[PDB]
Amino acid sequence: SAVWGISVYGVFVLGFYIAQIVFSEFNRMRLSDWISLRPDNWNATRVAVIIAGYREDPFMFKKCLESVRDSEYGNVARLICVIDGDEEEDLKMAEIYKQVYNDNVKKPGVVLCESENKNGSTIDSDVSKNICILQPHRGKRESLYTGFQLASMDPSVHAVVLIDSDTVLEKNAILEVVYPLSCDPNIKAVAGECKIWNTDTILSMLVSWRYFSAFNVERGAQSLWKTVQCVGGPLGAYTIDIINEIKDPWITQTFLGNKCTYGDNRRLTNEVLMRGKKIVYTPFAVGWSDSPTNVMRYIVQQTRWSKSWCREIWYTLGSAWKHGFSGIYLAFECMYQIMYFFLVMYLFSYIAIKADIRAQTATVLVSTLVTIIKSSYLALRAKNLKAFYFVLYTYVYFFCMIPARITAMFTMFVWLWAKQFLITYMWWAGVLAAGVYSIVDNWYFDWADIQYRFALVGICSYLVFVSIVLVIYLIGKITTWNYTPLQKELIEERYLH
Amino acid sequence: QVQLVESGGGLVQAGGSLKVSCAASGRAFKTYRMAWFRQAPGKEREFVSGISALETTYYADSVKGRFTISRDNTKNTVSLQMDSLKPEDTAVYYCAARRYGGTDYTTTGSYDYWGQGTQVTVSS
Amino acid sequence: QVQLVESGGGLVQAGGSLRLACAASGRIFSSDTLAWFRRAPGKEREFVAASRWSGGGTDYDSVKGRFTFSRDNTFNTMCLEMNSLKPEDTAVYYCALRTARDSYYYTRNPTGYDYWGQGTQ
Ligand SMILES: O=C(O)[C@H]1O[C@H](OP(=O)(O)OP(=O)(O)OC[C@H]2O[C@@H](n3ccc(=O)[nH]c3=O)[C@H](O)[C@@H]2O)[C@H](O)[C@@H](O)[C@@H]1O
Ligand SMILES: CC(C)CCC[C@@H](C)[C@H]1CC[C@H]2[C@@H]3CC=C4C[C@@H](OC(=O)CCC(=O)O)CC[C@]4(C)[C@H]3CC[C@]12C
Ligand SMILES: [Mn+2]
Ligand SMILES: [Mn+2]
């Protein structure tokens, strides 16, 4: 049964990845075909840029503002900055905004989504001047709603670009993220690429390639059928028409009789999906964000994301009937995402309980081969040799995403720490206990048996491969070869500041 | 550290069947390679059969297809079933167990435990 | 932040071409609007040309065809090439910059340009 299980797991994990690669290539081909027909100096869409932030890094916030102002798009209405502030510690961002754009920081005493008159004209009069609002701290959804209302009060605005306060945009990011809206009339949202620039630590270095894979391959596969499940927070274009009709249900959201304060962009893309509309993904709109370098902060972030995913997967599954064919792909992806977690958990439990050295070695070898193939494709697509670091993302997944998923599932059905990391510590202790039990139960040496020789040689080779990859990473870190070209210049400017 | 107890032997005449067994008392019998030797007339302990901890079976060339070895870790017993016996297949049988060893598994000195032997006779 | 210096002021007897150069010190964003204005003796500042640090090069006024506006972001300078100069086309040429800081709206009003250069010819 071990051979059947391992072969089934390998075919299940691969194959789908190959199909996703093919679909992403087709989506990129279609995007290139659309772009090649674009006229030069095309600015037919009038957009408004909305930025929402809460106590951001003043250096990175200034970099984001300057990257927005240094864009080469010829049709920009104005910049709408919303700060979840109104307090003394939050004027440090208003000062940055005044340094970059102007002294138009309006400070209303009310949150627009909690007032009787939610029209944007209640807190702003002139629609031509770039605006900054210092709103009382409620959340990201409230700041986004205020930005939506300030953008929709201009009758000439057709679309909106949503970026984070730590997102550094390329010069053509806005154009490349708003162009696909004008190709198909049924397209209402576009998702750009998000790239990790602080690839200096090992965790961030692995998360950068996880981001690359998850955006490019997966979102391209989704965009071939125009059913992208989540629009990236750091960069996303929305139609004002869909915004004006999904902003209220998305802001007055209650799940199991309580307010929802996570998955702000996942729920927005969901609301777009459940109305039968289409979302695409463009690899040519690129914005740079960063990743957590600490494991525990990453675990909290992944717990939040897993909570959002658990909340939204049922609505995504239930809204698949109004897409017809190519909505079958959405349901298949949802079922695959559901089944993958249980497949990994069951495989780990079965292999651990039945302490067979052949099964363990075969499983680790198959997993290593699969991630080697995936990293080879990633290196081919990115034209970068550092994409082979992705072979070590299995450790990050096993030790961070499974605890986060289990914690989110348990939450959705001293105590503050026990509600965040108790399950993670239990999982780590269980993995250590399983390893110790296997080592103790398989404590013998027999070089006259070719099966024992095979198992020992395989496990030793896997350990040597992991050590070689780690040594290569350390060498690259010492010489700063792992540094993203944006990271080097960011460090250089921050030194002179 | 396993104590080996023999159980077998009988008045086999010709071409009969006799399943010999060896019971091992210990703690980690699953992590043990068990072999069978015979001290035939002429004091030379030769290899008869063997089974490793991963159920890999080794047989001598003379008795390649005649004998079948099996193990039961639940019962902690190794069994050797004999088919189509020969007059040369008369001897006292010993079961040997080892835990750590190299490529040498046929030599008598490659096993660290030796319980006892049972007499098996063939007539004509 | 930005200092604009003009060069290329010569004498043309209404029968030759001329080139004017504007060099800018300080960071210029791609959303900024750079313009050439004209001020004749006993005359106000009249618009001549404008464009962005990216492209578009519109609003050539009534001198369309004669004058060409070409930028160079690598050298942080731009130029205006003048062809078929006329006796009426003698004045002082000004280099002006407008920031998208307050608003992104495009205007030809000289009051909307917060950075100016020196004279020329
Ligand atoms: O859970 C989510 O939805 C967030 O998950 C991650 O968040 P992380 O990278 O950990 O970064 P944060 O510092 O939370 O950035 C989130 C953005 O929303 C803003 N924010 C955060 C918290 C808050 O209460 N209000 C608020 O406006 C932050 O200033 C920032 O611009 C993603 O990077 C965000 O794009 C996504 O919005
Ligand atoms: C007790 C001590 C001395 C031993 C060390 C702990 C081991 C028992 C752990 C450490 C690494 C673990 C492995 C790390 C990664 C994987 C990948 C995982 O494969 C996947 O499911 C792919 C995940 C993805 O798609 O990213 C299966 C479990 C496995 C083999 C884990 C099995 C248990 C291992 C070998
Ligand atoms: Mn930050
Ligand atoms: Mn962030």
The continuous run of DSSP H or E covering C95 comes out as strand C92-98
CB contact under 8 A, B32 and A442: no
Burial of C8 (0-12, 13-18, 19+ CB in 10 A): middle
Quote the ligand 4 centre to A228 CA distance (angstroms): 21
Specify the pairing of strand C67-72 against strand C3-7: unpaired
User: Strands across the sheet with B45-51, in order?
Assistant: B11-12, B113-122, B91-98, B33-39, B45-51, B57-59
Q: Provide the sign of the torsion angle of the four alpha carbons A418, A421, A424, A425, taken in this order.
A: negative
The continuous run of DSSP H or E covering A446 comes out as strand A445-446
Please report, for the domain that includes residue B118, its CATH number: 2.60.40.10
> Which amino acid type is present at position C57?
G
Taking alpha carbons only, the member of A112, A109, A130 closest to residue A121 is A112
- Tokens matching residue A426: 């239990």
Long-range contact set of residues A252-261: C-beta below 8 Å, sequence gap at least 24 = A255/A311, A260/A311, A261/A139, A261/A141
- Residue B94 DSSP symbol: E
> Which amino acid type is present at position C61?
D
- Tokens matching residue A497: 């500041």
Structure solved via:
cryo-EM
Q: In chain B, what residues touch A358 (CB-CB under 8 Å)? A: 54
- Give how many domains chain B has, as a whole number: 1
Taking alpha carbons only, the member of A329, A334, A332 closest to residue A312 is A334
Count Cβ atoms below 10 Å from residue A456 Cβ, excluding itself: 15
Query: Which of A47, A63, A67, A69 is most worth mutating to test chain C (most C CB atoms within 10 A of its CB)?
Result: A69
Count Cβ atoms below 10 Å from residue B120 Cβ, excluding itself: 21
- Phi-psi bin for C58: left (phi > 0), alpha (psi -120 to 50), beta? beta
Specify the pairing of strand B113-122 against strand B77-83: unpaired
The residue with tokens 């596969």 is A221
Quote the ligand 2 centre to A398 CA distance (angstroms): 6
- Tokens matching residue A150: 């300030």
Distant-in-sequence, close-in-space partners of A53: CB < 8 Å, separation ≥ 6: A61, A81, A82, A83, A84, A93, A143, A164, A165, A166
Distant-in-sequence, close-in-space partners of C35: CB < 8 Å, separation ≥ 6: C47, C48, C49, C50, C51, C95, C96, C97, C98, C108, C113
Decide: helix, strand or coil at residue A482: coil
Helix/strand/coil (H, E, C) string of C18-74?
EEEEEEEECCCCCCCEEEEEEECCCCCEEEEEEEECCCCCCCCHHHCCCEEEEEECC
The residue with tokens 């290539």 is A25
Tell me how far apart the alpha carbons of residues B122 and B89 are, in angstroms, rounded to a whole number: 7
Pocket of ligand 2 (CB under 6 A): A 344, 348, 363-364, 367, 393-395, 397-398, 431-432, 435-436
Count Cβ atoms below 10 Å from residue C33 Cβ, excluding itself: 22
Specify the pairing of strand A445-446 against strand B100-101: parallel
Distant-in-sequence, close-in-space partners of B112: CB < 8 Å, separation ≥ 6: B97, B98, B99
Task: Let me know: does B54 contact B36? Beta carbons within 8 Å.
Answer: no
Count Cβ atoms below 10 Å from residue B44 Cβ, excluding itself: 10
Q: Provide the sign of the torsion angle of the four alpha carbons B92, B97, B98, B103, taken in this order.
A: positive
Task: Let me know: does A295 contact A203? Beta carbons within 8 Å.
Answer: yes
Beta strands (DSSP E) in chain B are 3-7, 11-12, 17-25, 33-39, 45-51, 57-59, 67-72, 77-83, 91-98, 100-101, 113-122
> Which amino acid type is present at position A429?
A
Tell me how far apart the alpha carbons of residues A285 and A67 are, in angstroms, rounded to a whole number: 13
In chain C, breaks (C-N over 2.5 A) are found after none
Query: With the CA atoms of A28, A34, A40 and A44 taken in that order, what torsion angle do they form, in degrees rounded to the nearest 10?
Result: -120
Tell me how far apart the alpha carbons of residues A185 and B22 are, in angstroms, rounded to a whole number: 81
CB contact under 8 A, A128 and C54: no
- Cα Rg of chain B (Å, integer): 14
Nearest to A130 among C29, C54, C103 (CB): C103
The continuous run of DSSP H or E covering C118 comes out as none
Nearest to A449 among B28, B56, B104 (CB): B56
Check the annotation: does A121 bind a ligand. no
Taking alpha carbons only, the member of B54, C27, C70, B19 closest to residue A67 is C27
Task: Let me know: does C36 contact C78? Beta carbons within 8 Å.
Answer: no
Task: Let me know: does A17 contact A374? Beta carbons within 8 Å.
Answer: yes
Taking alpha carbons only, the member of B36, B64, B32, B58 closest to residue B48 is B36
**Is A84 touching ligand 1 by the criterion CB < 6 Å?**
yes
- Residue A186 DSSP symbol: T
> Which amino acid type is present at position A19?
A
Kindly list the structural domains of chain C, giving each domain's residue range(s) and its CATH number in brackets, ordered by start.
Answer: 3-116 (2.60.40.10)
Task: Let me know: does A223 contact A187? Beta carbons within 8 Å.
Answer: no
Ligand nearest the Cα atom of residue A63: 3
Q: What are phi and psi of C24, to 5 degrees?
A: -115, 130
The continuous run of DSSP H or E covering A315 comes out as helix A295-318
Specify the pairing of strand B113-122 against strand B91-98: antiparallel
Q: What secondary structure does DSSP assign to A391-428, as a single string?
A: GGHHHHIIIIIHHHHHHHHHHH--HHHHTTTHHHHHHH
On the CB side of C43, CA atoms within 13 Å amount to: 14
Angle value at C-alpha A233, between A229 and A210, nearest 5 degrees: 75
Distances (CA, A) of B37 to A353, B91, B97, B112: 35, 9, 11, 14
Task: Let me know: does A73 contact A47? Beta carbons within 8 Å.
Answer: yes
**Is A120 touching ligand 1 by the criterion CB < 6 Å?**
no
- Tokens matching residue A214: 């998850």
Range A24-299: architecture per CATH: Alpha-Beta Complex (3.90)
Count Cβ atoms below 10 Å from residue B57 Cβ, excluding itself: 13
Burial of B123 (0-12, 13-18, 19+ CB in 10 A): exposed
Check the annotation: does A142 bind a ligand. no
Tell me how far apart the alpha carbons of residues A111 and A218 are, in angstroms, rounded to a whole number: 37
CA distance A452 to chain B (A): 8
User: Strands across the sheet with B77-83, in order?
Assistant: B3-7, B17-25, B77-83, B67-72
Angle value at C-alpha A16, between A10 and A18, nearest 5 degrees: 100
- Residue A79 DSSP symbol: E
- CA-proximal residue: ligand 2, atom 5 (nearest): A435
- Cα Rg of chain C (Å, integer): 14
* Residue C52 contacts A, CB cutoff 8 Å: yes
* Residue C41 contacts A, CB cutoff 8 Å: no
Q: Domain locations in chain A?
A: 2-15+340-495, 24-299
Residue of chain B nearest A440, judged by CA positions: B28
Task: Let me know: does A64 contact A119? Beta carbons within 8 Å.
Answer: no
